Every structure is written in C-alpha cells, then in structure tokens.
Write a protein that binds this ligand. Structure first.
Ligand code: HEM
Ligand SMILES: [K+]
Length: 291
C-alpha cells in the first residue's frame, strides 16, 4: 500500500486557513459542551483515533483514507463518544465540501490544539478518501487497563519511541474520561481546556490512590478530585518514561516542541508526500488574525 498525498484540486493555503477559521469560530461558539469544557478535547481525540489505527507493517489504517466515516470504524467500541466531534464537524464539511475527510478530521485536532493555547502544529493537506473496504477492523486502538510494557509495545506499531509516547500522552491533561464511554470517569487536572504540562505535574505531585470505579474498573484517584488511567499511571512506573515525565514537568516549552513534532508525525503516518507537495502549513489562530 502506498498512499500518496494528493492536493485537493486548486486549493491553497488560504483555502485551508478558512476551514481552520470555521472550526475555530465554532469552537468558540459551542462552549457548553460537556459541561463547559467545549469541543476542543474531543476533536483532539478524534484526530488521534482516526490516525492510531495505523499499522507500520502493512501500511493499512492511519488518517489518509477518512475511513472513520464508515460504519465498521465509526461503531468501534474504542471510538465511543467520538460521534460528538463528528457531528461538530459535519456542518463544516457542508460549508467546504471539497476538503477530504482525512484532511478535515486531522485539521480539527490541529485547530483544537492551537486554539486551546497549545503550540503550533504544522499541517499538511492531501489525504484522499478511500473506499469502504479500506476500513481497518476494530481492535487496533489501545486498551487503558495495562502497563508500561503494553504501551511501549503498542506504540511501536506506530513508529513512536519513548520520547514520542510520553509527549503524546500529555494530551491527557485535556477533557476527561466518561463512564458511559470507556468505563472510566473523571478529569485529570483542573485546566482541562487549555493546553499545558499539567498532566505531568499531576502525575508527579498528587497522591494517587488505586480504586475501582462504578464500572468495576481500576483507576488512580487523587484527593484533588482528579483521576489517571492505569496506562497513564504506568508512565511513572517505568524508569525510562519517568525521566521524561520529569523533564516535561519541568519545562513546558520542551513539552510543546516535542508534542508538536509527535502529533504531526502521528497524523502523517502512512502517507507519502511527493516531491512537489506544498510545504506544511502553519495556520494563524483566530487571535492572530484579530477575528
Ligand atoms: C495508551 C494510550 C491511550 C489510551 C489507552 C487512551 C485511552 C483514553 C480513554 C479511555 C479516554 C476517555 C474517553 C471517554 O470516556 O470519553 C481517552 C480520553 C482522551 N484521549 Fe486518550 N488514550 C491514550 C492515548 C492518547 C493520545 C496519544 C491522545 C492524543 C494525543 C489522547 C487523547 C485523549 C483526549 C484529548 C481525551 C479526552 C476526551 C474528552 O474529553 O472527550 N489519548 N483516552
Ligand atoms: K483527560
């Protein structure tokens, strides 16, 4: 399988900035979602989920094909709750029907991150919608009740090393877990719709208590009222992951640069960008544009 990036015919930077702006304005407007958290977090998750089905071994899955739009994928148990981000984006796609699905799902995550004060994430267009049959089977997304070895191993399938895994996990500072969705409940910090290194700080500074939740699943609960999944907790159990946690707890910039590189890589996995392809775009946030 080779998936070559193909620019939406005759669209340029300016065209994409517009899609961005549309997402951004809508994020601003629909702020009541999930008790005032907003749709930022769910979009980040959407982008990650359409991208994590990737398999470095045969090149199946990944964001290119926009397969999330098909039933098999959309109904994946691991994607429970993502339907809210889809619906959010739907009117957007209607406004700009020439964008591919993969491009839109991915752009929304980038947009989400940046509007939430995160770092700038360079983004590339060119994903192409593929047929129903290119839809990966369910089961390629990770489980939350495991440990550091699982995480290490899981992530390797995506070509991500230790440093990338830890940077990527910091997105867990955002949003929260929802019982009806994954059998987990609670946020992991206080700033859950602003992008920061909070995840790392919480992991190192709170006093976590293992407990079983209403769904009969274990989770690490803190006095402050926050939670961490076993997989999140595992970053402090592994000696190699811990030193990285500590690095990010200490320097938000390092965290931002690393996250940026990794998120882009995650969203570009499985895609071949030809030689003449435009460079990656760096979108202006609403604020940078005075909108
Ligand atoms: C071991 C790896 C991962 C596991 C097991 C995992 C599992 C989960 C779980 C169980 C939830 C809660 C879903 C719900 O009930 O609504 C979730 C939430 C979240 N996931 Fe992950 N995740 C991991 C990797 C990542 C990464 C790499 C990203 C992005 C870079 C991320 C982004 C998030 C976000 C932003 C939310 C909050 C969603 C919301 O507030 O609706 N996770 N994760
Ligand atoms: K969270």
């Amino acid at each position: 399988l080779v998936h070559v990036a193909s620019v939406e015919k005759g669209r340029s930077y300016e065209d994409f900035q517009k899609v961005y702006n549309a997402i951004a304005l809508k994020l601003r407007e629909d702020d009541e979602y999930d008790n005032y958290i907003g749709y930022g977090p769910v979009l980040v998750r959407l982008a990650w989920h359409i991208s994590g089905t990737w398999d470095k071994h045969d090149n199946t899955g990944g964001s290119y094909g926009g397969t999330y739009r098909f039933k098999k994928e959309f109904n994946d148990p691991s994607n429970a709750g993502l339907q809210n981000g889809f619906k959010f984006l739907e009117p957007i796609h209607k406004e700009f029907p020439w964008i591919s699905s993969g491009d839109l799902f991915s752009l929304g995550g980038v947009t989400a991150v940046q509007e939430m004060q995160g770092p700038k994430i360079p983004w590339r267009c060119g994903r192409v919608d593929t047929p129903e049959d290119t839809t990966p089977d369910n089961g390629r997304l990770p489980d939350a009740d495991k440990d550091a070895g699982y995480v290490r191993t899981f992530f390797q399938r995506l070509n991500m090393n230790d440093r990338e895994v830890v940077a990527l996990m910091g997105a867990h500072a955002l949003g929260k877990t929802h019982l009806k969705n994954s059998g987990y409940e609670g946020p992991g910090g206080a700033a859950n719709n602003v992008f920061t290194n909070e995840f790392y700080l919480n992991l190192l500074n709170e006093d976590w208590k293992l407990e079983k939740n209403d769904a009969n699943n274990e989770q690490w609960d803190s006095k402050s009222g926050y939670m961490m999944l076993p997989t999140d907790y595992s970053l402090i159990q592994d000696p190699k992951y811990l030193s990285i946690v500590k690095e990010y707890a200490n320097d938000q910039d390092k965290f931002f640069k690393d996250f940026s590189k990794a998120f882009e890589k995650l969203l570009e996995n499985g895609i071949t960008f030809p030689k003449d392809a435009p460079s990656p775009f760096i979108f202006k946030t609403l604020e940078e544009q005075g909108l």
